[PDB]
Design a protein around this ligand. Sequence first.
Ligand code: CL
Ligand code: CL
Ligand code: MN
Ligand code: MN
Length: 293
Amino acid sequence: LNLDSIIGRLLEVQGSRPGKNVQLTENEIRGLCLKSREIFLSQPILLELEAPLKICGDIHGQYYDLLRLFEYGGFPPESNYLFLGDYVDRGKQSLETICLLLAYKIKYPENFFLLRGNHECASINRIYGFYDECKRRYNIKLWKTFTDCFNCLPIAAIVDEKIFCCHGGLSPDLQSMEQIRRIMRPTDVPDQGLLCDLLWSDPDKDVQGWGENDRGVSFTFGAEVVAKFLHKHDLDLICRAHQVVEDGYEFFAKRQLVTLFSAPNYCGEFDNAGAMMSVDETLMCSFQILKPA
Ligand SMILES: [Cl-]
Ligand SMILES: [Cl-]
Ligand SMILES: [Mn+2]
Ligand SMILES: [Mn+2]
């Protein structure tokens, strides 16, 4: 497995017309999945990370936008990175996207981190594009190799004991961080429960406590749920992704929560910006933004 050759080929298309594919070999991709899965299982399911770092939300196969985020933020390992999930589905280049991210995880495993999004799940990505992309460009056996790797991704991260990060949001079942630590891998994303909620829930300005989520999965939570959680666990901020936001980032509950979404012009259906959050050594947050086209 020649990681530098793989990364070189992935990066060669920088400056090309957004759309030019990078087609690694099936054995290369299988290697990326197997080695990264070993690393994910060797690190905790609840990551404990240090600032400074850059945090990115959803990518959804917008590979050329991933390359712009690295061009703006610094290619690994010039900056440390945490991604919050949803690497695949909807976009045109999920394969290049996930392969570059797994190659950087293997190259820089203590400086580059990937969380699980709700789309890193076989039954979801069966429907929303990644299965079809693997069947077209590779084969379904390689799709299953990716699933096996996805099933071992970590679920949440805490930066310097102060910023709690996950793809979706909070859970009415989350009373102790130990409940996250206890989750065994590999696992699928269940249709309900703590792991489902961490990958699927959303904040809501108009709900008091916990509400029913319009997605038909998981819950919504309001501002006082956020405040109570931060106080209980001695945290300063929840950082999550999952929802498209026009500015690429959006604060909630008097800046106690932020939503990041990193795929601009999302799947051609939205006129949103994509943002990456820069967290400095003192945990102050600023943004680098891919403005809409
Ligand atoms: Cl190396
Ligand atoms: Cl509330
Ligand atoms: Mn998403
Ligand atoms: Mn999502």
